[PDB]
Symmetry: D2
C-alpha cells in the first residue's frame, strides 16, 4: 500500500536465522524451500565429526548447520566479488545457484560422515566406487524431483535444466570427459572455485568448518576468512576469469593449510576418535545382513545398499547406531555387543604410531597385509602371550595439503597493489625458508584388540620390532614401551 515513482512497493521479507558462527543470516525463499524438505533436514541427524563426539564432547554438531554456513559463505563471496567488479556480470541467478550448491554439497553424507564413505562402504562393498559427493548429486536430484522445486526455481529467474546441471558440477566437478564444464562458460570460471575448489582447495567449505569445528571442539581457529574475502579479486588467468589473492596475503594462505593440517592432527585423526569410527564400522558390518530399510516401491535395502536408492538413503542416518544399540533381535547380538563395548569404554588399545622413512609410500593395495606383518615380527622379549594377525589393527592415514604431494600455493594466482588486474605467481622460495619441505606424509597407527595388560605389553614389542624391520621411524615412546627392542636399530641411535 505504498508507492514510489507511481509503482506499488512490494515488501518481500526474507527469513532470518541465527547461527553461532556467522550470526544472523538471511535466507532467500528459494533456499528456504530447498531446506524444508526431508532430504535436507536429514542432515540434522548426521554428526559432522562422526565418532569425534566420543572424544571431544563439544563436537555434537551436525551436517545441517554446517551446510547452512557453507551456503551463506558462498553467497557472501560471490556478492563481494560482484560488488567490487560489476564487469564480471554476476547475476542474482548466479548468486542463488552458488548458494544452493553450498547448501547441498553435503547431501550425500552417510552415518557419521567420513566414516561411512571412508571406512564402511569400502569394506562392505569393495566392488563399488562411492563418494559422498556422488551421493550429494543423486540426493540433490531426488530432492528436486520429490519436492517440485523446478517451478520455484523458474519463479526466481533460474533456468532449471542448465542451473541444476551447474549446481551438480559445483558439487562433484566435471560430469563428463578444453573447458570441461557446461553449466557456465570460461568467463565465469571463478564461480566453480567457490564451494568446492578442485584446483587448489581454497573454498568456503573449509572456511565454515574451520570456524564451526573449532567453536565446538574447544580449539581456536587462526585463519581469517573475512580478511581473505576483502582481498579477493577476479583476474584473467589462461583465458579464464579466476579468483586471485592479494600478493602479500600469501603467508596467510600457507597458514590456512597449516591450520587444516593441525585440525586433522589434533582432532579429526585423533587416535581414539579413529578407533571409535573403526568400532562403529565393525558393528555396522556385523549388522548389515539383518537391518532392513524400506526404499522406493517398498523394496528392501541394507545399510550397504541404501546408497543405491535415495528414498532408502534418506532414512539412513546416525539413528542406525541407536537402532543397533537398542535392538533385541539375537541376530544383532554381535553388532550390539560392539556398541556396548563403546559405551563401557572397553575400546581397542592404541599401541603406537610410526611413519615411513625414505621416499617410501605404503600403497593402499598393501593395507590389508599389514596386521599380518606385525604379528610375524619376532621380538627378542620374553612374553606371556602370543598374538595373531587378527589381534592387530593397522590404520594408515594420508596427511597432506589437499593435493597429494603438490603445493597448493603453486596453483594460486595473486595480484599486486600497483596492477590489480594482472595475475601473477609466487613460488615457495619467494615467501619463506621456514615453510614445509614436503606437502604429504603417512601416519601409521597400530592398535590391539586384546586389551589386558599382558597382551598390550606384548603388542608393543611386536609393533616396535615391526618398525625396526621395516626401517620405519622410531616411535616417540619407543625406548619406554620397548626398551629391549630399540637398541638393535642404530639408525635410531
Amino acid at each position: 500500500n505504498l508507492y514510489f515513482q507511481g509503482s506499488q512497493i512490494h515488501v518481500d521479507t526474507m527469513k532470518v536465522i541465527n547461527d553461532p558462527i556467522h550470526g544472523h543470516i538471511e535466507l532467500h525463499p528459494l533456499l528456504v524451500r530447498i531446506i524444508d524438505t526431508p532430504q535436507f533436514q536429514r542432515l540434522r541427524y548426521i554428526k559432522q565429526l562422526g565418532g569425534g563426539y566420543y572424544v571431544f564432547p563439544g563436537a555434537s554438531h551436525n551436517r545441517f548447520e554446517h551446510s547452512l554456513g557453507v551456503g551463506y559463505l558462498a553467497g557472501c563471496l560471490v556478492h563481494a566479488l560482484g560488488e567490487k567488479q560489476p564487469e564480471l556480470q554476476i547475476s542474482e541467478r548466479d548468486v542463488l545457484c552458488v548458494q544452493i550448491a553450498g547448501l547441498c554439497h553435503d547431501l550425500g553424507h552417510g552415518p557419521f560422515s567420513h566414516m561411512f564413505d571412508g571406512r564402511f562402504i569400502p569394506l562392505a562393498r569393495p566392488e563399488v566406487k562411492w563418494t559422498h559427493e556422488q551421493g550429494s548429486v543423486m540426493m540433490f536430484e531426488h530432492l528436486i524431483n520429490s519436492n517440485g522445486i523446478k517451478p520455484v526455481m523458474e519463479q526466481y529467474g533460474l533456468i532449471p535444466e542448465e542451473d541444476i546441471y551447474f549446481i551438480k558440477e559445483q558439487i562433484v566437478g566435471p560430469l563428463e570427459s578444453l573447458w570441461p564444464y557446461k553449466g557456465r562458460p570460461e568467463n565465469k570460471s571463478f564461480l566453480y572455485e567457490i564451494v568446492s575448489n578442485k584446483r587448489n582447495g581454497i573454498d568456503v567449505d573449509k572456511w565454515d568448518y574451520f570456524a564451526r569445528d573449532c567453536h565446538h571442539l574447544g580449539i581456536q581457529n587462526n585463519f581469517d576468512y573475512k580478511r581473505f574475502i576483502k582481498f579477493a579479486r577476479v583476474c584473467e588467468v589462461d583465458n579464464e576469469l579466476r579468483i586471485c589473492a592479494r600478493d602479500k596475503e600469501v603467508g596467510n594462505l600457507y597458514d590456512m593449510f597449516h591450520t587444516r593440517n593441525s585440525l586433522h592432527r589434533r582432532a579429526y585423526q585423533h587416535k581414539v576418535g579413529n578407533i571409535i569410527d573403526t568400532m562403529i564400522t565393525d558393528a555396522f558390518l556385523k549388522a548389515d545382513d539383518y537391518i532392513e530399510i524400506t526404499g522406493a516401491g517398498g523394496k528392501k535395502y541394507r545399510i550397504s545398499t541404501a546408497i543405491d536408492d535415495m528414498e532408502a538413503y534418506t532414512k539412513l542416518t546416525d539413528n542406525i547406531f541407536l537402532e543397533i544399540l537398542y535392538s533385541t533381535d539375537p541376530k544383532l547380538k554381535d553388532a550390539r555387543e560392539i556398541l556396548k563395548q563403546i559405551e563401557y569404554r572397553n575400546l581397542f588399545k592404541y599401541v603406537g604410531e610410526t611413519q615411513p622413512t625414505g621416499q617410501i609410500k605404503i600403497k593402499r593395495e598393501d593395507y590389508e597385509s599389514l596386521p599380518k606383518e606385525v604379528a610375524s615380527a619376532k621380538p627378542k622379549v620374553l612374553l606371556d602371550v602370543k598374538l595373531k594377525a587378527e589381534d592387530f589393527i593397522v590404520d594408515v592415514i594420508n596427511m597432506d595439503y589437499g593435493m597429494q604431494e603438490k603445493n597448493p600455493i603453486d596453483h594460486v594466482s595473486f595480484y599486486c597493489k600497483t596492477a590489480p588486474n594482472r595475475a601473477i605467481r609466487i613460488t615457495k622460495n619467494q615467501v619463506s625458508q621456514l615453510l614445509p619441505e614436503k606437502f604429504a606424509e603417512q601416519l601409521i597407527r597400530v592398535y590391539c584388540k586384546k586389551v589386558d595388560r599382558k597382551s598390550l605389553y606384548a603388542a608393543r614389542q611386536y609393533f616396535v620390532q615391526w618398525c625396526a624391520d621395516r626401517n620405519f621411524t622410531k616411535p616417540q615412546d619407543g625406548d619406554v614401551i620397548a626398551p629391549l627392542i630399540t637398541p638393535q636399530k642404530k639408525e635410531w641411535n
Copy 2:
C-alpha cells in the same frame, strides 16, 4: 588414573577415576542422545548440544566451587570424599531427563499419564540407583574413601531435595549445609547447574552470556546462618545476583520459550501421544513398556531417548501413520500458526486447572467481524507460560545471605530497596500464546479476530500487533485506548 577432557565451555577438565567409572555406563552415556533444548534445535541451528556435555560441566563446576570454598576455609573440613560426592551429584543430576528434555516431563507425561506425578529429578534418583546397581559402583566408591550407604543417600538428596517429610537431611549434617547449595540450590536457585547452562546454551544459541560465575566463586564465603554453615555472597555483589536472574529470564524469553520452539515441542508431543499405543520398549525381564510407561522401568527408560523421534519418522507400520504424519509436517515446515500473545492484567493468575478450558473460551468469543470461516475449540492451541525468578512470586535475593568487607564471618541480609529502584516490582508473570491448527489465510484471519476479542473479553493486555491484526476489535476496549 585420572583423565583430561577438553570442553569448549570450560576448557581442559580433570576427571577423577571414580567419575570416569560412573560416566562410562549405558545409564550415563544415554545423555548423549537427548538434546538439552529439545525442539529448540529446530529454531536455533547451533543448539545441537546434548545433556551429556552439560552434565560433565555441572560435575566440573560443582567440584570447582567446593574446592575453592575448602581452600579458603580449611575450618569447614571439606574432604575429598565430600568433593567427589558433590561432583557425582553434579554429573548425575540430569539422569532422569527423557526425550527432548523439558518437553518430556513438561508436556508429554502430564498428557499421556495424568494420574502420575513425574519429574525428571525423581527420574534421576531412580536412574542413579539403577546405574549404581547395574555397574558395581559401590566397591569402586569404597576404594576411593566413600561410604556408599551414606553417600549414595547424600547424592540423592543433592539431586531431589529432602527424601522425607528441623534439619531435614541425613547425608550430611548442618555444619556442611553449604554442600547442599552447590548442585541444585532449593533455597534460592543459585547453583552450578545454571552457571553451566547459561554459558553452554549461549555458546550454542548465538546469544552472549553476561553472568560471570568465576567472579561469584571468588567472592563466595561460608558463614553461620541459624546453626548452619551456608554460602554467602559479598554484599556489593548483590547487583550481579539480580542480573543473574534477569539473564535467566532473558534466556527463557529469547530462546527457551520461543513461540516456534514451543509449537515444535507441542507437535512432537502430539506425535508421541499418537505413537504411544504402538511403540514397544523392552525393559527388565523382557517386559514391554510404552513411551509413557518406560518411566516405570529404568532398564526400558535407558533406551528411551530422542531416537524415538526418528523411529517414528522412519516407521512403515500403518498404525504409526498418524504420528509419522505429524513429524513429516515438521520436516516440511507446515507448523501450526502463531496468532498472538497476551498477558493477564490485575493480580489475576490463570490456574493450571483451567488451561484445558482456554481453547474453548477463544472459540466462544463473538467478534463483530464478517468471517468466511467458523473455528472450533480444537482448532486453537493456548500455551500458558509461567515466567518467574525461580520461586514463583518470591524474590530469590531475600533468601540470599551476604557478608561485608569489614566483618567477613558475619552473615547479613539485603532488601530490594537497599539496592535499586530500577529492579522488578514483581517476580512472576504469565504469558499466553495462542496458535491455530488451521493454516490457510482465511482461518488465520478469523483466528486473529477470535483471539483479540477473547483478550478484550478477559481484560487481558492488548496484543502488540492488535490494531493491525484486528482493527475492528481493538476500538471497543477503551482501557486499550
Copy 3:
C-alpha cells in the same frame, strides 16, 4: 584509494578515502591520547582503550546501518553522499572530548569554570570546524560528491542536535529524518555510538556484552511517523530494546560508576585544579591558555590530552608540587576511603544546586557514639550519581516506533504493560557515595558513624553494611528494622 583496517571488535573494515583524509589529521589523531573510560583503567587493567578506535567503530557502524536501510528500501533514496556524511559524523562525534573523557566535562570544567556551559559535543562541533579549515577538507569533500556548506552543517547537527531554537533541522529534510537517528539519537538514545561502546568496553573490561546490534540492524525498517521517515524496530524485538538499556545500566553500575574509578577521577580532577594556574598550552597566534581555558581555542585544545597527567606527574616546578603530590598518592595507591552508599527514599530527588552542601550535612550529623576524632566538612566527599535510561524519568521505549510482520510499512507504539510486568517501575534514580579524605583507622570509623547517622536523619536507604559499620546507629531507625 580505500583502506582496510583491522579492528578487534568489528574485524576488517573499509575506509573510503575521504574518511582517511579526515582521520589523518592532528585533530583526529589526538583521540589516540584520550582514554575512553578515563580513570577506569586504574581499576580495570584491560581498559587501556582510547577514543580513537571507538570513533573508527562508530563511523563504521553508522555506515553499516545506513547501507543496510538503503539496500532494503531503495525508495528512501539514500545516496553515497548521505552515507559518507553519516560516517563522518560517526567518526567525529567524539572530537570534543578532553583528558580522561567524561572526567573533563563531567567533573573538571564545572569546577574550574563554573560560569561557562561546556559539553564535549559542543567541543566536537568546534574541533570539527577547526579540522575542516586547517586541513583543506572542503575541496576533498567536493571531489566525492559532497556539498560542503550543507553537509558540514548536516554533520554538525548529527553531532550536537538542532543548531537553532516544526522540522528543526536544515542539513536534511523530513523524508531523511532517519539519518539523524543513527549517530546520536536525541529522541530515544538508540544509536550506533552505544553499540560500539557496549562491545568495545566489554572486550577491554573483561565483562561480556549481551546486546546484539547486528540482530537489531536486520530487523530495522524505515516507516512514516507523522510526516517523517523514521527508523522502526520489529514489534517482537521490544524485549531486546528494554535489555539494551538494562545492559547500559549494568555497565554503568559495574564499571563506569565503580566507586574506586570515580574517586580516582575525583583525585585526578583535584590535581588538574591545583595545576591549572601553572600549566601553559600555546594556542592560535602564540596565545597562552590554561587547562581550563584551552576549550576556548581549538589549536590549544588539540594539544590537551591525557598527557597532561604525566606532564604534572613528571614536573619539577615547585608551583606544581601540590598537584604532583596528589598524582603520586594515586601511584602509591593512597586513595580517599570509601565510606558507603545510600539512596533517597520517596519521590525525593537531590538537586544539583545542593550537591556542594552535602559534605557539610554529613559533618554536621550528631552520632551518639564515643569517637576519638572529630571530622569536618572538608574531610568528606559526597558523589551524587544519576542513573537512568537516558531520558531522565522517561521510558525511552515510549519514544520508539515498531512495525508488525503483517503490515511492515505501518508504524505502531507499544506500552510497558503490553510487554512484561518484570520491567522497571521507574527509569531514574540517584546513588549517593560518601568518601573520607582522612584514611587512618580512627577517622574511618568516625566517618562511618557520621555517614549512617546522616542517612538516618535524611530518611535515606539503610547502607548494606550499616549494621556492621555502625551497629550503634542503625537501631534508632525503625523504618530500617
Copy 4:
C-alpha cells in the same frame, strides 16, 4: 572472632583484579606492594607493541597489564607443578619469588618497548650494550630500595638477600660466569624455566603475550597454554629437575613456535609498523640533545642517557613522543616535524622485500652499508629522478624459532604415559615431514624517504636491480613493479 581447634581464625582477604585475558586473579599482598610503586606503575605508559598501535588500532595495551598476566601465569604453573608433585618441595616462598620475577620481568622497557632497545639506543649510543632485561634488574633494585620492600618480603617468609638475587637471575639469566645459578640449587632448576626460559623459550611470558596481543590485534590465538600446564611434569634430566612435556604434545609445541612466527609476520614485523618505529626513533634522535629529564640529586639526563639513572628512567615513557609533538622550542622543530608527518600519514614509502638465497647471511656489521648498495645499482630503465644512499632505508629482520639456527624442540624433554618420571627426547623426523627444514631466516625490507610518484617508481627499479645483483630472492611483485629488470635474471625464470 571465630575459633577452630581452640585457635582464632585469621581472615586474610587477597585483592582480586579483573583482567580480560585471565579473568579474576588474586594478588598476594606482597605483590600488591610491589605493584603500587612509581617504578611499576610506569608500565601503564609504555605500549606493548610500540608503533604497532598506529597500524592495529586495537593494540592500545601497555606493558602494565601484560606484566600482571605474566606474574599470574608464573604462579599458576608453579602451583600446578607443586600440586601434582609434592616431592619437588615447592614452597609458597618459591611461588612468590616466581610471581615477582614474572611481574618485574618487563620493568626495564623504555618508550615503545622493543623500539627503544632494538632501534634507538643502538643508534644513539653505539658504545653501550643495553637490553631491557638488564634494565629490569636495575629498575627492580631501585623499586626494592626506594619503597622499603625488604621488610615486607621478610614478613612473608622471603629471605631478601637470596631471593632478590634469585628474582634477578630469573629475569636476566646467570649473573656471573657447572650450575651457574646461586638463588636456587639444581633440584629446583625447573623454577628458572618458568618466567624466561633461556634453554628453549617455552615460558609464561609467551603464553601471556600470545593471548593478550591476539585479543587486542584482532587475530586469533591457536596455542592452548592451559592444556600445556595440565600435561607438564618435572623429571630428572642430567642431574637437574626440569619441566617436561607429555610426549604426544610435541606437535602442539611445534605449533606454539609456528604461532610465534606468524605473530611476528602478521603483526610485530608489519612493514608499516616498523617504519613508524623507525620514524619515531629518528624523531628521538633529533630531540636527544634538547630534552632534559631530571634524575637522582637533580642531575640532568637525556633520552639516551636516562638508562644510566633509574630515577630519570622512571620518568621516561611513551610521554616523550607527546612532549616532542607538543613542544614549541625551535630546537625541537626537526624532531617535532617528523612526528607531525606521522600524524598526517606522510610516511616513508615501502618499496619491497627480499631474502638471501644460499646459506648466505647478512652480517649486522654490514647493515649500515646496504642503502649505499641500493643507490649504486644501475637499473636499465629511463627514470626522471636519481636517488642517493640517504633516500633509502634497508631494514634487516632476523626471523627464527628463538634460538637462531637451532630447533628449540631438540632442547625439550618429554615423558610417556607408561613411565611419567622418565625424561626422553624426540627428534624432528619422529614427528612429521611437514615441519620446517630450517629455523631461521632473514627478511630484507627496503623503503624510500622520497614519497612522490616519480621517486617511488625509481626506487622500485634500484631495489629490484639490487636484488638481481646480490642474487637475492625475486620480490613477490617484481614482475609488476620492475618488469624491465626481472627478465635479466634467469635464476628468477
